[PDB]
């Protein structure tokens, strides 16, 4: 009983046990030889013929014994007189009550406190010649029936033989030699020895001498009929078993090799001598998962709760992993980095200082107002006094308004950066601590410690929007005032009289439509005309390498387009009366201006540039009896402050540009210098001084119930491996 | 000890043996053989010698029985045992006959356990047995043992077989009752060797050591494993009581209380038990003889059908009344004269196919056989003119006659026809020895009494060489007297009747000496050389030439009639230069008239060799056709049909047509003569030597037998047909006496 006990620690921790099958002729005893070796009586046995069909049984080990089968779901017969019944039911109701057979195997499992993981099987009889209903071919159906289950390996041989009857006429010991010649496998057993003939006996069989078997033979006395009628119980079978070996003449040497105990130490012997050879992996096997808990189990080993070098030891080492984990999960420190998500709050709050920037598109870019507005500033800080010269008093007061509220976006941005970061330490709390009130303080005092900081940095925030009202200095990479557009040329590039095709020709450059395109040119397009007051260009693309052809400006006129067109859009036509220098009009040479100032913006250049109006009684003034004082004009279209609205524009929308760019650029680092530095300083250098002064302290880091079960199964599987080994070494001791 | 049964069964079917023996047919009883078959220990021996009564098999646990036995009990008087291999030697006790067969068996076999197919004739002489066979078998296994070979079922299996699968043999199908009886090898030897259970008798022993709390009453009812003539429960001694030497009165007593006793089977306790097997055994014997009985009766009876044909003329037997004597020659007389007239006559019965003769068809043969050796024998030519011609000139020799004489025909046929006379003798000795060996052939038969084929063949012989003296004077006298008178008054033709001699006969017929036509005078091949297309080409047609015309053909058919080419104002002329006539060629033409006719440039005729040309340029100037004289081209009115072959170059008498008168004459004359003697001889004979003769077979012949004596020595043995006559009276009573006693048995 060594096999025993390991079986049980491989089940209390948690082998290709050999199969055993029963052969033999009919009626020689085969199911009580079985049910002896299992222990209990539950197997049909009578006269005549009973196991007709293949049983598997499949004892396995547990704390209670029952029995169970795989037709008769759930039901756990606890006597075992209803399982012979169930058997026998079964059996005859798919083989018939009249003798038939069936090669269907009846599965059952019977569980019990001290028996191996074995599959024991019983066959039925082999028989010559059929009787009641069986097929004439029966020998042959039994007999393929039971090789379909011998003539594998591992699979112990019970060759059961009568006593009756003589060993020469056995039919378990031809099928025994037919399928293990050597004797591998084989044990011999040989019953009925009480009905033997008056003067004769089985001494020269069980002495292994008649036919001579590896292993040698042995002899059992079951119960006979009328003792299973009679309701003998075991022990009585096996006390008369022993005295009868005792008591008879020819046998009373040989006593302690008979019996059915004997048997069951040989199938017990021959199952430890199949089971060795597979010690080193199993041994290992075990002894590699004992590795895994010995480094944990060392501290469940003795405790004494309450006791304040482990506690202590605890709040050390569980805030260090904490820290650690922190600015591993912000600062994104290796090792083993998280490639599922994007980070805990790295990604996560870095895509934040790169999304805020869409938060300042989508305001505000508006709109016709700012113009109006900016008019009224030029127009109030001239209250009485008036005219020249443009005042700045009225830049300085439009994008004091304009940046005013850039306070919304920024303070949105921190509370997302804390929304963002006050649940990263909620990302690495949920899981490291598993003890009650130490994971939920921890979290108190961190979020707290972020609570206080977001007010430091709204502060902060609202300081620096603030300084950007203060002197709104014009020293930067704008350009200064009276440089629109793209003026001069770098300082007009240090040449300006000799310069014919030195950028003399670059003054206004914009995007105006053509209507009317020749053939050879192409389609419909808007190009980039570059304007000037004696000169003027026309580009395809950026490159400025076009230079095809210079157009002019003086002595050129100007039109409308004929009525019903839309103009929207407006289009306007160029002609000359003496001369055809256009040129090139495309009837005819058309410019469309998209907006409704455009227009008027693009006569007064040309209008300042040379180019006469396009007033009616114009044209009878067309090139004689010219500037004859300016009647059509009345000085003027727009003074004098759409030029200075426009200037103003350009000035505000410059500086709105680097400022956008200053506060999109400094905002992080304002945020990540008095918030997320501070908090990991926090983190690192004050959390454990500050967590041990809050809480009665003494039930701080305890169970947590579930920890406390989950110890105690560790330690006991740690107590069960250690078993495991020690009955393991016991078994190869030997 | 027993058998009673047995006692009581032997007189009867002794009886029946010796009557079916004594009848001297192989007829048998046959009666059938006991084997006894199983497994290994099942109790075999024990239910044999059970059956026997005598204790002299082995026995005991373990192999015992390693080689078959063969006891063969014979009914004798002296009781006794003896082998095969120890001849001479005369056994009393039993313990020794069983001592001395386990040392034959452990000599042969060997000490361990080895077997033998080899068995062990044993004989038992007692006056209380049968002759049967009892067979005992060892127990087949399933593993060998010991030093038996790997293949000993196999060959256990062949020894049992060799001895079950013959028919009519009983099986005692042995088994234990401690085993079930699904596993008993005796049930599955006996459903493969006999699957309706006509002869297998199941018997169940060691009933009193089966397991505590069963009994086999299901079996023992023949309930469990249906068999057709039932199972016997039998108790033998256990090994105890071998080494107890127990006797058999008290087994037979234990046997008895023990069916007795037993609650399960009280009421089976008649049908139990040794005894009971014994009796069943009896009683499948008897049921056996008293079933093939039938079959050998009706057998016999239709072998007795057929001696009692024989023996319904044998049924009184009364040696050596004249009565037996006196029908015995009328019986041979009337056969051997009904054969004769069979051999010869042509009458029924079973007329002889195979040979082709026969007395008939070998006589009738010669009858035409003998004209052969008319024609073949006598010949002469070339002289016969001679002679002829002097008759001519001397039976009016003083003085010419204006006319033909008639004596020389008369003098010529009487010298020729005298000839005849050796043919006919000749004939009729020949037909007189084919005859006489015919009856000697029908006397062959006629053996199985002797001195009688003595005297028959001697009356027959007698006879047909006294007639052949008279039918010998009878045929001289009729070819004597075709000498006499020699009228022309026959429808042979008179004289002057061909002139110009002879047309064939006038065309061999009356009727066609019209239709026909007189071309033929003289065939023989003849080559044209230039042919047309409707002709044929070049080639050599057969032509013949006639003294008036000229025909051709080209088969021997005559259905063509083409034309009919003249001979009359004519010419000839040969070939021109260049050609190497040899092979000689003739043109035949016309000057006068260009009638040809048809020309195909040229008509020419071609011959083979020399003698080819000049006889057919002879056969034209005999016809009339012009020479080729010189004056070929002036044959215009000098020629008139030349030729000059009248009658011959130059002169002669005129004997030659005289003696051309005479020679026609004798050959139409000795033609009809020919006729006469070859229809009229065979009549001849038939009348006077062969119907004489079967008058004489018929009529006079029993009278003359039966003149000659002694009656008594006439007829005799011959011992065989009597040995036979005896021997079919002993079948005849002794299958009377075998039905009687068939008949006596049946009730
Ligand atoms: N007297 C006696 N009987 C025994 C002994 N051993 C077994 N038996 C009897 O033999 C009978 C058959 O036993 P069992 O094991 O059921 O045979 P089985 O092999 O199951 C028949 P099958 O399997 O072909 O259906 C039983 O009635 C049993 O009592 C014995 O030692 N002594
Ligand atoms: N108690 C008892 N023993 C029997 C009975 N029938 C046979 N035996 C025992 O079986 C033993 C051998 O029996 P036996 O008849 O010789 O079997 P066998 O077939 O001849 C052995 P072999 O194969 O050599 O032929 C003997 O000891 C005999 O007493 C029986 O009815 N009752
Ligand atoms: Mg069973
Ligand atoms: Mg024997």
């Given at each position: 009983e060594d096999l025993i006990p390991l079986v049980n620690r491989l089940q209390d921790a948690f082998l290709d046990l050999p199969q055993i099958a029963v052969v033999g002729g009919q009626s020689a005893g085969k199911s009580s030889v079985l049910e002896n070796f299992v222990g209990r009586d539950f197997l049909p046995r009578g006269?005549?013929?009973?196991?007709?069909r293949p049983l598997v049984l499949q004892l396995v080990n547990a704390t209670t014994e029952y029995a169970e089968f795989l037709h008769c779901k759930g039901k756990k017969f606890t006597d075992f007189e209803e399982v012979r019944l169930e058997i026998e039911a079964e059996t005859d109701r798919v083989?018939?009550?009249?003798?038939g057979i069936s090669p269907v195997p009846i599965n059952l499992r019977v569980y019990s406190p001290?028996?191996?993981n074995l599959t024991l099987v019983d066959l039925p009889g082999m028989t010559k010649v059929p009787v009641?209903?069986?097929?004439?071919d029966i020998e042959f159906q039994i007999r393929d029936m039971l090789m379909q289950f011998v003539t594998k390996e591992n699979c112990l041989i019970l060759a059961v033989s009568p006593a009756?009857?003589?060993?020469?006429?056995?039919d378990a010991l031809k099928v025994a030699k037919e399928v293990d010649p050597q004797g591998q496998r084989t044990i011999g057993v040989i019953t009925?020895?009480?009905?033997?003939?008056?003067?004769?006996?089985?001494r020269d069989v069980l002495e292994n001498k008649l036919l001579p078997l590896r292993r040698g033979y042995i002899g059992v006395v079951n119960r006979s009929q009328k003792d299973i009628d009679g309701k003998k119980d075991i022990t009585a079978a096996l006390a008369a078993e022993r005295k009868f070996f005792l008591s008879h003449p020819s046998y009373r040497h040989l006593a302690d090799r008979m019996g059915t105990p004997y048997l069951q130490k040989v199938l017990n012997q021959q199952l430890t001598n199949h089971i060795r050879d597979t010690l080193p992996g199993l041994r290992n096997k075990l002894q590699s998962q004992l590795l895994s808990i010995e480094k944990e189990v060392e501290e469940y080993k003795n405790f004494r709760p309450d006791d304040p070098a482990r506690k202590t030891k605890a709040l050390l080492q569980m805030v260090q992993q904490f820290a650690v984990d922190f600015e591993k999960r912000i600062?994104?420190?290796?090792?083993?980095?998280?490639?599922?998500?994007?980070?805990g709050g790295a990604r996560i709050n870095r895509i934040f200082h790169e999304r805020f920037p869409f938060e300042l598109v989508?305001?505000?870019?508006?709109?016709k107002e700012l113009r109006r507005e900016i008019s009224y500033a030029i127009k109030n800080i001239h209250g009485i006094r008036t005219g020249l010269?443009?005042?700045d008093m009225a830049f300085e007061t439009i994008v004091k308004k304009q940046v005013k509220k850039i306070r919304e976006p920024c303070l949105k941005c921190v509370d997302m950066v804390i929304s963002e970061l006050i649940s990263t330490v909620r990302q690495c709390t949920k899981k490291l601590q598993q003890y009650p009130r130490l994971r939920e303080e921890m979290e108190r005092i961190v979020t707290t410690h972020i609570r206080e900081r977001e007010g430091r940095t709204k502060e902060q925030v609202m300081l620096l929007i603030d300084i950007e009202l203060a002197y709104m200095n014009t020293n930067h990479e704008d350009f200064i005032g009276?440089?629109?557009?793209?003026?001069?040329?770098n300082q007009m590039?240090?040449?300006?009289?000799?310069?014919?095709?030195?950028?003399?020709?670059?003054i206004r450059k914009g995007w105006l439509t053509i209507n009317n395109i020749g053939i050879m040119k192409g389609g419909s397009k808007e190009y980039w005309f570059v304007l000037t007051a004696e000169n003027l260009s026309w580009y395809k693309?950026?490159?400025?390498?076009?230079?095809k052809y210079m157009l002019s400006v003086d002595n050129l006129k100007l039109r409308d387009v004929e009525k019903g067109f839309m103009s929207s859009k407006h289009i306007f036509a160029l002609f000359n009366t003496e001369?055809?220098?256009?040129?090139?009009?495309?009837?005819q040479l058309e410019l469309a201006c998209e907006t409704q100032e455009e227009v008027d913006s693009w006569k007064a250049s040309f209008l300042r540039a040379g180019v006469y109006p396009?007033?009616?009684?114009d044209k009878e003034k067309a090139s004689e009896?010219?500037?004859?004082?300016?009647?059509?004009?009345?000085?003027?279209?727009?003074?004098?402050?759409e030029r200075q609205v426009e200037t103003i524009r350009n000035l505000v929308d410059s500086y709105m540009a680097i400022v956008n760019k200053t506060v999109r650029d400094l905002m992080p680092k304002t945020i990540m210098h008095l918030m997320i530095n501070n908090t990991k300083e926090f983190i690192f250098s004050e959390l454990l001084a500050n967590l041990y002064?809050?809480?009665?302290?003494?039930?701080?880091?305890?169970?947590?119930a579930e920890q406390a079960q989950r110890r105690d199964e560790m330690l006991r599987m740690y107590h069960a491996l250690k078993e495991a080994l020690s009955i393991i070494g016991d078994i190869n001791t030997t």
């Open positions: 006269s005549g013929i009973v196991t007709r083989t018939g009550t009249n003798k001290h028996v191996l009641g209903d069986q097929p004439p009756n009857s003589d060993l020469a006429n056995s009925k020895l009480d009905l033997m003939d008056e003067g004769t006996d089985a600062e994104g420190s290796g090792d083993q980095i998280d490639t599922y998500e994007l980070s989508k305001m505000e870019f508006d709109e010269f443009t005042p009276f440089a629109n557009a793209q003026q001069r040329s590039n240090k040449k300006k009289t000799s310069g014919n095709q030195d950028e003399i020709l670059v693309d950026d490159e400025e390498k076009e230079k001369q055809r220098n256009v040129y090139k009009d495309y009837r396009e007033r009616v009684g009896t010219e500037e004859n004082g300016s009647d059509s004009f009345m000085h003027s279209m727009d003074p004098q402050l002064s809050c809480g009665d302290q003494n039930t701080l880091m305890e169970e947590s």
